[PDB]
Amino acid sequence: INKLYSDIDPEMKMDWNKDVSRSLGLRSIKNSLLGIITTRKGSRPFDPEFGCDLSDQLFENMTPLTADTVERNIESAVRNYEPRIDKLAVNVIPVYDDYTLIVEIRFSVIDNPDDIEQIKLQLASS
Template identity: 40%
Template structure:
């Protein structure tokens, strides 16, 4: 991996995984670290982290909401607030909530952002599942 952007950070891979040969945890760096950090922020329910109970984004409170403009705007606000508070390495430009598959229990959330230090604009798509028993992390 090119280490010229190493100032963007390095952290454990999400979900945590271990290399059996080196007996070390798998690590991610740079843009991938930021992408995974955003998934962690959006996937974490406030109160899950005992030492940082305000951390996260309470999207699960929207699971049983009618998918209307009020719910969409509430989701966008929850995400904007969480990213503003917990991911200082990016500038969030837009949050787009795609509700086309909401009858199937899926709402796709796209975050359009710029990595501040290197001025690279990118985006992620976070699949938020409205049905029980589905993969919430989307990773």
């Protein structure tokens, strides 16, 4: 299934043999995911709803609610624009000292819903 979900390499790296480099299957799924999360809401040209907003103010102050509030959006955001993930779960650990959200996401691609894999993402700039 790694063949499936052929997507251009986000970096457009030089691939050996000179063709466009590629993100392979499930390598792309991360990228699109990694893409959708960072993007500020409203920054899509005709789609305001895209991207998971982050308020550095709210990002500054973490509370199990504030965490939970964020916890939904990503889980919400990813769920709408990324049908390739069947069973997805988010974990967010906000870090107190620098005010950093680190976020874990365990998800399962459609083809292997029993398989589990996680990603590690952190956010900063408070």
